[PDB]
Amino acid sequence: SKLSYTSFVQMVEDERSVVSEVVIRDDGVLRVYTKDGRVYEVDAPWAVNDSQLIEKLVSKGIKVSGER
Amino acid sequence: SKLSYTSFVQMVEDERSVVSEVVIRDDGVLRVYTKDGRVYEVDAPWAVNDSQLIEKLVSKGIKVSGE
Amino acid sequence: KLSYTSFVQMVEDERSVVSEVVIRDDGVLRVYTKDGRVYEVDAPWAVNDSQLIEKLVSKGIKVSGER
Amino acid sequence: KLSYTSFVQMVEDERSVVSEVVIRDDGVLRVYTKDGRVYEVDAPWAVNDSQLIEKLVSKGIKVSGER
Amino acid sequence: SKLSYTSFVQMVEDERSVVSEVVIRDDGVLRVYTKDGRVYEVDAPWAVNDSQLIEKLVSKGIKVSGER
Amino acid sequence: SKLSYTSFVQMVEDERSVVSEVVIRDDGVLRVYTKDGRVYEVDAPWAVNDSQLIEKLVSKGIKVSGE
């Protein structure tokens, strides 16, 4: 369930990327959903305002949404 | 009513975008009006003071305002 | 006790010494080395240093947050 | 790398060296010392050694689980 | 929200103990409720079958319950 | 229907206990019958093979069985 930020970036950059959705919570927690029906949580307050990360996710067609 | 940031960006980039207007709220919620009379909410605090997004929208012919 | 300035140096350094970094919400970083050592760095600004976290990840160093 | 037998010894030992123990669900213990060192112990049975965890806590040593 | 097992034992042994309820999940996670309306989670697979801990909690009048 | 383990122990220890019978299920759920015709469920896996609990109950005059 818990995923390091490094492992998260690994999953995103994966050429056969299994990441389907990333939920960006306002308390600095990312909820990451995979195509095969897994869900992870990443403690990363810095990703919350990380424009290039977000646009990288979007450019990959990964569903990105905020949560509060 | 609820719209992902990804889908929002896609709808903006659309060759024949149906996005007519975007309101950027201080609380980080974007209100997106479409041509068919629909209105969506996009939770995206990262977009509030995004100059690049604003300029993109303006250049696409989409009305943008901040309140 | 380890200064932030020494930390950035240890990260940028050529020879792989840093193996894991934990960014705690209280502003303290825990820095793990490959020779079985661990340091603490007082740096509440380290959560905003996107360049540093970016290079950390780029070098395959495990980065995680805790609260 | 640290043997479990050396670990129990380090804990039972008179002089406060062990400061924190993390019991991971994969059977690995992370042992932190007060002189800024960290060891790993392969011991899947360590989660069942109630005597050890009891004395660990009794000495004010921080004990936590992770998964 | 996250609480170390040591801090948990500290809270239990406290003479002015603020612990009102301990929920023992079958996946080795403890959910600890306080009298002042706080809730914590303790990762401790070993407490799950810890008879003396449980009877210590019960003897203190702390509400102990299992969850699955 | 749902009963805490603490309350269960209290009801058993009661000077004039209303507990008439306890069934100890393999799945860790205790079914507790009272004299007034009530029946409660107690989630307590730790009580399954508890010899001390069984002997306590038997000595209190409470019918115990395991299925």
Swiss-Prot record, chains B, F:
Q: Which domain of life is it from?
A: Bacteria
Residue numbers on the Periplasmic membrane side: 1-67
Q: Where in the cell is it found?
A: Cell inner membrane
According to the UniProt entry, the coiled-coil residues are none
Q: Which family does it belong to?
A: In the central section; belongs to the AAA ATPase family.
This molecule's function is given as:
Acts as a processive, ATP-dependent zinc metallopeptidase for both cytoplasmic and membrane proteins. Plays a role in the quality control of integral membrane proteins.
Q: How does it assemble?
A: The isolated ADP-bound cytosolic domain forms a 6-fold symmetric protease disk and a 2-fold symmetric AAA ATPase ring. In the absence of nucleotide the AAA ATPase ring also forms symmetric hexamers.
Task: Write down what this protein is called.
Answer: ATP-dependent zinc metalloprotease FtsH
The source organism is Thermotoga maritima (strain ATCC 43589 / DSM 3109 / JCM 10099 / NBRC 100826 / MSB8)
The top of its lineage is: Bacteria, Thermotogati, Thermotogota, Thermotogae, Thermotogales
Gene this protein is translated from: ftsH
Positions spanned in the full protein: 34 to 100 of 610
